[PDB]
XYZ file of N, CA, C and O in Angstrom:
576
model
N 82.578 101.505 115.501
C 83.196 102.759 114.952
C 83.689 102.640 113.506
O 83.794 101.545 112.939
N 83.993 103.797 112.926
C 84.494 103.906 111.562
C 85.962 103.477 111.503
O 86.732 103.775 112.410
N 86.344 102.773 110.439
C 87.728 102.344 110.299
C 88.635 103.553 110.124
O 89.764 103.588 110.623
N 88.130 104.554 109.413
C 88.881 105.778 109.186
C 89.230 106.471 110.502
O 90.163 107.272 110.551
N 88.485 106.164 111.566
C 88.743 106.787 112.860
C 90.075 106.317 113.428
O 90.597 106.899 114.370
N 90.626 105.261 112.844
C 91.901 104.721 113.298
C 93.028 105.609 112.727
O 94.208 105.426 113.034
N 92.639 106.599 111.921
C 93.596 107.511 111.294
C 93.249 109.003 111.420
O 94.116 109.814 111.739
N 91.992 109.359 111.158
C 91.542 110.752 111.243
C 90.802 111.021 112.559
O 90.322 110.093 113.217
N 90.704 112.300 112.967
C 90.004 112.630 114.217
C 88.564 112.117 114.166
O 87.869 112.315 113.170
N 88.118 111.472 115.235
C 86.768 110.920 115.275
C 85.571 111.828 114.992
O 84.746 111.528 114.123
N 85.449 112.922 115.734
C 84.330 113.840 115.544
C 84.673 114.877 114.481
O 84.163 115.997 114.502
N 85.526 114.482 113.543
C 85.988 115.355 112.475
C 85.181 115.187 111.186
O 85.072 114.076 110.655
N 84.600 116.284 110.696
C 83.847 116.248 109.444
C 84.830 116.583 108.348
O 85.598 117.539 108.483
N 84.811 115.813 107.271
C 85.696 116.089 106.155
C 85.028 117.190 105.309
O 83.806 117.356 105.349
N 85.830 117.950 104.567
C 85.308 119.015 103.718
C 84.820 118.437 102.403
O 85.245 117.357 101.994
N 83.934 119.173 101.740
C 83.394 118.766 100.448
C 82.688 119.926 99.746
O 82.396 120.946 100.364
N 82.421 119.763 98.453
C 81.753 120.800 97.661
C 80.273 120.875 98.014
O 79.640 121.921 97.867
N 79.724 119.751 98.472
C 78.318 119.671 98.841
C 78.125 119.431 100.336
O 77.375 118.536 100.740
N 78.810 120.234 101.149
C 78.696 120.124 102.595
C 79.661 119.164 103.261
O 80.240 118.285 102.618
N 79.830 119.330 104.569
C 80.725 118.467 105.323
C 80.134 117.077 105.520
O 79.001 116.931 105.989
N 80.903 116.052 105.160
C 80.448 114.678 105.319
C 81.147 114.089 106.537
O 82.283 114.450 106.842
N 80.470 113.194 107.245
C 81.075 112.581 108.418
C 81.895 111.365 107.978
O 81.769 110.906 106.834
N 82.739 110.857 108.876
C 83.554 109.682 108.576
C 82.636 108.493 108.366
O 82.866 107.656 107.494
N 81.594 108.429 109.186
C 80.648 107.338 109.100
C 79.958 107.229 107.760
O 79.633 106.133 107.325
N 79.748 108.354 107.088
C 79.065 108.331 105.800
C 79.831 107.565 104.730
O 79.270 107.252 103.681
N 81.101 107.264 104.996
C 81.942 106.533 104.040
C 81.918 105.008 104.252
O 82.619 104.257 103.571
N 81.100 104.562 105.196
C 80.968 103.142 105.497
C 80.747 102.329 104.227
O 79.925 102.683 103.388
N 81.487 101.238 104.093
C 81.338 100.388 102.928
C 82.196 100.763 101.734
O 82.399 99.945 100.837
N 82.704 101.990 101.710
C 83.533 102.433 100.591
C 85.016 102.139 100.776
O 85.471 101.819 101.884
N 85.748 102.230 99.665
C 87.198 102.080 99.651
C 87.628 103.543 99.626
O 87.148 104.324 98.807
N 88.518 103.929 100.523
C 88.941 105.316 100.563
C 90.403 105.509 100.205
O 91.276 104.792 100.687
N 90.651 106.492 99.348
C 91.999 106.836 98.919
C 92.408 108.115 99.631
O 91.700 109.118 99.553
N 93.523 108.079 100.350
C 94.010 109.289 100.994
C 94.962 109.845 99.945
O 95.934 109.186 99.583
N 94.670 111.029 99.429
C 95.528 111.631 98.421
C 96.440 112.696 99.022
O 95.986 113.757 99.446
N 97.734 112.399 99.059
C 98.721 113.326 99.594
C 99.283 114.176 98.462
O 100.124 113.718 97.686
N 98.810 115.418 98.374
C 99.244 116.338 97.331
C 99.303 117.787 97.838
O 99.185 118.043 99.035
N 99.485 118.731 96.917
C 99.569 120.146 97.270
C 99.688 121.012 96.020
O 99.936 120.503 94.917
N 99.499 122.318 96.191
C 99.646 123.245 95.077
C 101.150 123.425 94.978
O 101.881 123.144 95.932
N 101.618 123.892 93.831
C 103.043 124.141 93.653
C 103.883 122.867 93.706
O 105.032 122.877 94.147
N 103.303 121.763 93.267
C 104.029 120.510 93.232
C 103.875 120.009 91.795
O 102.831 119.479 91.419
N 104.913 120.217 90.962
C 104.942 119.812 89.550
C 104.347 118.444 89.187
O 103.419 118.378 88.376
N 104.862 117.340 89.769
C 104.304 116.023 89.436
C 102.870 115.843 89.930
O 102.146 114.973 89.443
N 102.465 116.649 90.909
C 101.103 116.576 91.417
C 100.177 117.040 90.304
O 99.141 116.433 90.058
N 100.561 118.130 89.637
C 99.771 118.687 88.539
C 99.545 117.638 87.471
O 98.496 117.601 86.838
N 100.549 116.798 87.262
C 100.435 115.767 86.257
C 99.573 114.614 86.723
O 98.920 113.960 85.911
N 99.545 114.364 88.029
C 98.766 113.242 88.541
C 97.320 113.520 88.912
O 96.455 112.668 88.716
N 97.056 114.702 89.451
C 95.708 115.063 89.874
C 94.619 114.867 88.809
O 93.546 114.358 89.112
N 94.876 115.272 87.552
C 93.850 115.092 86.519
C 93.589 113.631 86.167
O 92.438 113.244 85.977
N 94.644 112.824 86.066
C 94.451 111.415 85.740
C 93.679 110.758 86.881
O 92.873 109.850 86.662
N 93.918 111.235 88.097
C 93.208 110.711 89.255
C 91.754 111.158 89.175
O 90.841 110.366 89.416
N 91.553 112.432 88.838
C 90.215 113.000 88.727
C 89.398 112.271 87.666
O 88.218 111.992 87.866
N 90.028 111.956 86.539
C 89.349 111.245 85.459
C 88.956 109.843 85.932
O 87.922 109.310 85.533
N 89.795 109.250 86.776
C 89.539 107.916 87.313
C 88.368 107.985 88.291
O 87.534 107.088 88.345
N 88.307 109.073 89.046
C 87.252 109.294 90.029
C 85.871 109.475 89.366
O 84.927 108.750 89.667
N 85.760 110.437 88.456
C 84.488 110.696 87.780
C 83.979 109.466 87.048
O 82.785 109.179 87.045
N 84.891 108.730 86.434
C 84.505 107.547 85.686
C 84.083 106.344 86.521
O 83.146 105.630 86.140
N 84.747 106.129 87.658
C 84.485 104.947 88.472
C 84.155 105.062 89.959
O 83.718 104.071 90.545
N 84.354 106.217 90.591
C 84.079 106.277 92.026
C 82.673 105.817 92.440
O 82.507 105.211 93.493
N 81.666 106.063 91.608
C 80.315 105.631 91.959
C 80.162 104.120 91.837
O 79.844 103.446 92.817
N 80.397 103.595 90.636
C 80.273 102.162 90.371
C 81.185 101.288 91.231
O 80.760 100.249 91.718
N 82.435 101.706 91.414
C 83.392 100.933 92.207
C 83.375 101.312 93.683
O 84.168 100.809 94.472
N 82.470 102.213 94.040
C 82.277 102.623 95.425
C 83.534 103.072 96.193
O 83.992 102.392 97.114
N 84.096 104.217 95.815
C 85.263 104.726 96.520
C 85.236 106.240 96.606
O 84.447 106.892 95.932
N 86.072 106.789 97.478
C 86.165 108.231 97.662
C 87.633 108.598 97.756
O 88.496 107.745 97.977
N 87.907 109.880 97.586
C 89.257 110.377 97.689
C 89.213 111.443 98.767
O 88.250 112.202 98.859
N 90.239 111.462 99.608
C 90.343 112.441 100.671
C 91.688 113.111 100.493
O 92.724 112.455 100.518
N 91.662 114.422 100.293
C 92.878 115.187 100.104
C 93.593 115.429 101.417
O 93.035 116.031 102.337
N 94.823 114.935 101.503
C 95.653 115.135 102.677
C 96.669 116.132 102.153
O 97.627 115.774 101.461
N 96.425 117.394 102.476
C 97.251 118.488 102.004
C 98.608 118.729 102.649
O 98.800 118.534 103.853
N 99.544 119.159 101.806
C 100.902 119.503 102.210
C 101.106 120.977 101.853
O 102.241 121.443 101.747
N 100.002 121.699 101.648
C 100.068 123.119 101.297
C 100.638 123.912 102.460
O 100.356 123.612 103.623
N 101.434 124.929 102.134
C 102.086 125.759 103.144
C 101.108 126.660 103.900
O 101.337 126.989 105.064
N 100.014 127.051 103.251
C 99.038 127.928 103.896
C 97.599 127.612 103.523
O 97.322 127.051 102.458
N 96.685 128.008 104.402
C 95.263 127.765 104.215
C 94.650 128.318 102.935
O 93.697 127.742 102.412
N 95.169 129.435 102.431
C 94.606 129.998 101.215
C 94.989 129.120 100.028
O 94.160 128.859 99.163
N 96.241 128.669 99.979
C 96.672 127.787 98.891
C 95.880 126.482 98.979
O 95.510 125.894 97.961
N 95.631 126.032 100.206
C 94.869 124.806 100.433
C 93.501 124.916 99.754
O 93.128 124.041 98.963
N 92.774 125.999 100.050
C 91.439 126.236 99.492
C 91.369 126.494 97.991
O 90.385 126.121 97.351
N 92.378 127.144 97.419
C 92.336 127.392 95.979
C 92.483 126.031 95.309
O 91.705 125.651 94.432
N 93.491 125.298 95.761
C 93.812 123.975 95.243
C 92.649 122.991 95.372
O 92.190 122.416 94.379
N 92.163 122.801 96.592
C 91.065 121.869 96.821
C 89.774 122.245 96.084
O 89.000 121.366 95.669
N 89.542 123.546 95.916
C 88.344 124.004 95.231
C 88.123 123.415 93.848
O 86.993 123.386 93.360
N 89.188 122.932 93.218
C 89.085 122.364 91.880
C 88.889 120.848 91.860
O 88.686 120.249 90.805
N 88.921 120.229 93.029
C 88.751 118.788 93.113
C 87.315 118.438 93.496
O 86.654 119.173 94.235
N 86.812 117.306 92.983
C 85.454 116.832 93.246
C 85.315 115.871 94.421
O 84.247 115.290 94.618
N 86.378 115.694 95.201
C 86.317 114.776 96.335
C 86.301 115.438 97.720
O 85.892 116.592 97.872
N 86.735 114.688 98.730
C 86.765 115.176 100.100
C 88.161 115.655 100.484
O 89.124 115.476 99.732
N 88.269 116.262 101.660
C 89.552 116.746 102.138
C 89.590 116.889 103.646
O 88.606 117.259 104.277
N 90.737 116.571 104.224
C 90.913 116.728 105.652
C 91.108 118.243 105.816
O 91.877 118.850 105.075
N 90.385 118.876 106.754
C 90.523 120.320 106.976
C 91.984 120.725 107.229
O 92.740 119.976 107.849
N 92.373 121.908 106.746
C 93.750 122.394 106.897
C 94.232 122.488 108.339
O 95.337 122.045 108.643
N 93.417 123.055 109.231
C 93.833 123.196 110.627
C 94.356 121.909 111.270
O 95.101 121.958 112.252
N 93.980 120.757 110.730
C 94.477 119.496 111.278
C 95.823 119.184 110.646
O 95.998 118.127 110.034
N 96.760 120.122 110.786
C 98.111 119.981 110.247
C 98.806 118.859 110.990
O 99.660 118.148 110.441
N 98.430 118.712 112.252
C 99.006 117.693 113.100
C 98.743 116.306 112.521
O 99.671 115.516 112.351
N 97.483 116.012 112.211
C 97.121 114.708 111.670
C 97.879 114.320 110.399
O 98.151 113.143 110.166
N 98.230 115.306 109.583
C 98.929 115.034 108.331
C 100.322 114.425 108.502
O 100.666 113.463 107.817
N 101.124 114.982 109.404
C 102.464 114.458 109.638
C 102.407 113.068 110.265
O 103.270 112.239 109.998
N 101.392 112.816 111.093
C 101.218 111.505 111.716
C 100.993 110.512 110.595
O 101.693 109.501 110.497
N 99.992 110.800 109.763
C 99.668 109.951 108.619
C 100.947 109.740 107.812
O 101.227 108.633 107.348
N 101.725 110.810 107.660
C 102.977 110.718 106.928
C 103.855 109.599 107.463
O 104.411 108.810 106.692
N 103.978 109.522 108.787
C 104.787 108.488 109.426
C 104.155 107.120 109.261
O 104.781 106.201 108.741
N 102.918 106.987 109.721
C 102.195 105.727 109.623
C 102.317 105.096 108.239
O 102.629 103.916 108.120
N 102.086 105.880 107.191
C 102.144 105.338 105.833
C 103.483 105.483 105.112
O 103.631 105.042 103.971
N 104.458 106.089 105.776
C 105.759 106.269 105.159
C 105.695 107.068 103.871
O 106.273 106.663 102.862
N 104.980 108.193 103.894
C 104.866 109.057 102.716
C 106.049 110.029 102.732
O 106.042 111.001 103.485
N 107.059 109.763 101.907
C 108.254 110.607 101.860
C 108.174 111.699 100.798
O 108.907 112.687 100.857
N 107.302 111.513 99.814
C 107.142 112.499 98.761
C 105.732 112.429 98.198
O 104.991 111.494 98.492
N 105.355 113.435 97.413
C 104.032 113.480 96.800
C 104.155 113.725 95.294
O 105.162 114.268 94.823
N 103.130 113.340 94.516
C 101.857 112.716 94.893
C 101.955 111.287 95.426
O 102.762 110.490 94.949
N 101.117 110.970 96.407
C 101.079 109.630 96.982
C 99.639 109.264 97.315
O 98.879 110.093 97.824
N 99.263 108.030 96.998
C 97.925 107.538 97.280
C 97.993 106.332 98.212
O 98.789 105.423 98.000
N 97.153 106.337 99.242
C 97.095 105.236 100.189
C 95.671 104.689 100.169
O 94.725 105.437 100.386
N 95.520 103.392 99.914
C 94.191 102.784 99.851
C 93.746 102.176 101.185
O 94.409 101.300 101.745
N 92.597 102.638 101.672
C 92.057 102.194 102.954
C 90.604 101.723 102.896
O 89.756 102.352 102.264
N 90.321 100.611 103.562
C 88.960 100.091 103.623
C 88.253 100.860 104.739
O 88.552 100.663 105.913
N 87.321 101.727 104.350
C 86.558 102.569 105.267
C 86.007 101.892 106.513
O 85.924 102.515 107.568
N 85.623 100.625 106.394
C 85.045 99.891 107.521
C 86.023 99.401 108.580
O 85.903 99.752 109.752
N 86.987 98.587 108.168
C 87.952 98.048 109.108
C 89.133 98.982 109.350
O 89.790 98.911 110.389
N 89.384 99.875 108.400
C 90.505 100.781 108.526
C 91.743 100.050 108.040
O 92.870 100.501 108.252
N 91.527 98.911 107.385
C 92.620 98.093 106.865
C 93.305 98.765 105.677
O 92.648 99.352 104.825
N 94.630 98.677 105.635
C 95.402 99.264 104.549
C 95.444 98.266 103.395
O 96.068 97.215 103.498
N 94.763 98.591 102.303
C 94.719 97.716 101.133
C 96.013 97.807 100.309
O 96.600 96.789 99.932
N 96.459 99.030 100.047
C 97.678 99.218 99.285
C 98.290 100.572 99.573
O 97.732 101.360 100.340
N 99.440 100.845 98.965
C 100.114 102.123 99.157
C 100.741 102.586 97.855
O 101.419 103.613 97.812
N 100.522 101.830 96.789
C 101.089 102.209 95.503
C 100.023 102.492 94.443
O 100.272 102.352 93.243
N 98.846 102.904 94.896
C 97.754 103.216 93.988
C 98.129 104.333 93.012
O 97.487 104.482 91.972
N 99.159 105.118 93.328
C 99.567 106.193 92.423
C 100.113 105.627 91.120
O 99.984 106.238 90.066
N 100.727 104.455 91.205
C 101.303 103.808 90.036
C 100.294 102.900 89.342
O 100.265 102.813 88.114
N 99.467 102.223 90.131
C 98.477 101.310 89.581
C 97.464 102.024 88.707
O 97.058 101.505 87.673
N 97.049 103.213 89.120
C 96.073 103.949 88.340
C 96.641 104.318 86.974
O 95.900 104.396 85.993
N 97.951 104.538 86.912
C 98.614 104.888 85.656
C 98.643 103.685 84.709
O 98.317 103.802 83.535
N 99.025 102.532 85.242
C 99.116 101.304 84.466
C 97.754 100.704 84.142
O 97.591 100.017 83.130
N 96.783 100.973 85.002
C 95.447 100.413 84.863
C 94.391 101.491 85.153
O 93.747 101.483 86.203
N 94.182 102.414 84.191
C 93.249 103.548 84.223
C 91.810 103.260 84.627
O 91.154 104.100 85.242
N 91.313 102.080 84.275
C 89.933 101.736 84.586
C 89.733 100.806 85.770
O 88.658 100.229 85.946
N 90.775 100.679 86.584
C 90.700 99.853 87.775
C 90.291 98.409 87.594
O 89.515 97.872 88.388
N 90.810 97.770 86.555
C 90.490 96.375 86.309
C 90.923 95.580 87.536
O 90.279 94.606 87.925
N 92.018 96.004 88.154
C 92.497 95.305 89.330
C 92.230 96.090 90.614
O 92.842 95.829 91.647
N 91.316 97.056 90.535
C 90.926 97.852 91.700
C 90.505 96.818 92.741
O 89.871 95.831 92.391
N 90.813 97.039 94.028
C 91.506 98.152 94.687
C 93.027 98.049 94.728
O 93.677 98.735 95.508
N 93.587 97.176 93.903
C 95.039 97.007 93.823
C 95.719 96.626 95.129
O 96.578 97.348 95.622
N 95.349 95.475 95.698
C 95.928 94.988 96.952
C 97.452 94.826 96.919
O 98.017 94.296 95.956
N 98.108 95.289 97.975
C 99.554 95.155 98.112
C 99.878 93.662 98.229
O 98.960 92.901 98.610
């Protein structure tokens, strides 16, 4: 099975701009769970630097980003996610988000959690700061 299945629903397809991708399709990649939302001031400041990091290195460094939304409603979720080039956990899985919140101890956002797609192993939890200090991922995946 997929390591991500140790966190997200198994038969759950993640959302994307180019169709729904399965959890299995992320095999071999390093996955970043991005905990953000619309109407979150510091999120606005972090999302672009993250996006620039993604376009520049996600292919070569083999990683993906999955938006774990804290949006109050589905419409805000879709407007917000529509501007991102990565994946996202569907809004209706509001339940899974709070669980992840506990498991990873996410008390505020923006927050990034680094996960190895295969084993489901937690590589780090401070990728939000590492990307700022090291824009080109010289020390990617930034092990805790």
